[PDB]
Amino acid sequence: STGSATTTPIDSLDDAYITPVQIGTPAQTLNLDFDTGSSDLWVFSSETTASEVDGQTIYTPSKSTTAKLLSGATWSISYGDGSSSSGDVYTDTVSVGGLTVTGQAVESAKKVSSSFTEDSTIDGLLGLAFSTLNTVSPTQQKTFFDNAKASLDSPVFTADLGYHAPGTYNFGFIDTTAYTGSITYTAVSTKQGFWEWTSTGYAVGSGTFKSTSIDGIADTGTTLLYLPATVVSAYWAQVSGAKSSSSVGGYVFPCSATLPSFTFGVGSARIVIPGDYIDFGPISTGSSSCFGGIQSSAGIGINIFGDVALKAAFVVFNGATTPTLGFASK
């Protein structure tokens, strides 16, 4: 089997991407944030504290003839950005772009943090990291991909995120029309439960490539590109007036600037992030200070190849017995 679904930016800045997901019988369609940095499929629901729901579409398990309470199971997750959610668990039928999993754990939120409430466009998350990170207790549950894998034509999914435009998540096949050149594959460590890999270096604009190993994670659920302070300083030094602002929370730059591209290495291959992908707009409405899309990972504890990087590539998440990651230009 295969599946193919369009993923759409939630706003004009590509702050996140939402993908429609069918849950239950009859289908209830929710728009979920596909997150290769976590491993829980959780949704706003009829059980979510009413004051914490503000415009989201909810899953109502009582209206699904295939929903079953997973007795005794609870979940609770905290994300790198400080947001969180928790609740109980149902199993139900879940379909993405025509690919159906029966008995998928659907984690129903009883509580969500303010950031989730305040984002009316995101009805929940669909985790695509390794199932070892799943938070359900006392019996850990499998991701949608893990459940689907054996049925797929090939045990892969691909992320093709758009810049200020829709893109695609495919399951079970590689669309050879969706990228240019070849796909370069690189090793993955699953030791921390992430799609963790090592970039071979970087360049800023038309500058020379610096060969250096950068361990990080391919994370569709993180907006920005978080890299070591040395790398990030080298980038922003090429933008007149750019500075790190403790009050704002990262590098800012004059909105009048033209940003240089940023290249990262995948083996001997190179992925070029155009400068415009690195512009996250005014820090506050009407400001002429703009927020940068490349930020320091110092004090995160891990480098993160988030959407800024991934949207410059066609990305293969290869879930073979020994997982790997593939990147192509597009």
Q: Which amino acid does the sequence have at 165?
A: A
Is residue 215 part of the annotated active site? The answer reads: no
Please indicate whether residue 35 is annotated as part of the active site. yes
Provide the CA 145 distance to its chain's centre, in angstroms: 14
- Report d(CA 194, CA 129) in Å as an integer: 5
Task: Name 293's bridge partners.
Answer: none
Six-digit token string for 241: 């007036």
Tokens matching residue 250: 């990262």
- Spatial separation of the C-alpha atoms in residues 16 and 89, rounded to whole Å: 25
The catalytic position among 14, 33, 35, 92 is 35
Q: Which of 199, 261, 296, 297 is catalytic?
A: 199
Rounded CA separation 19/4 (Å): 10
CA neighbor of 225 nearest in space, from 246, 204, 248, 208: 204
Strands laid side by side in the 210-218 sheet: 269-273, 262-266, 196-204, 210-218, 303-305, 225-227, 294-296
Tokens standing for residue 204 = 């800023």
Identify the three-state secondary structure at position 63: helix
Beta carbons of 36 and 131 less than 8 angstroms apart:
no
Q: Alpha helices, DSSP H only, in 106-228?
A: 114-117, 144-148
Dihedral sign, CA of 243, 244, 245, 250?
positive
Q: Are 152 and 140 in contact (CB under 8 A)?
A: no
Residues tagged active-site: 35, 199
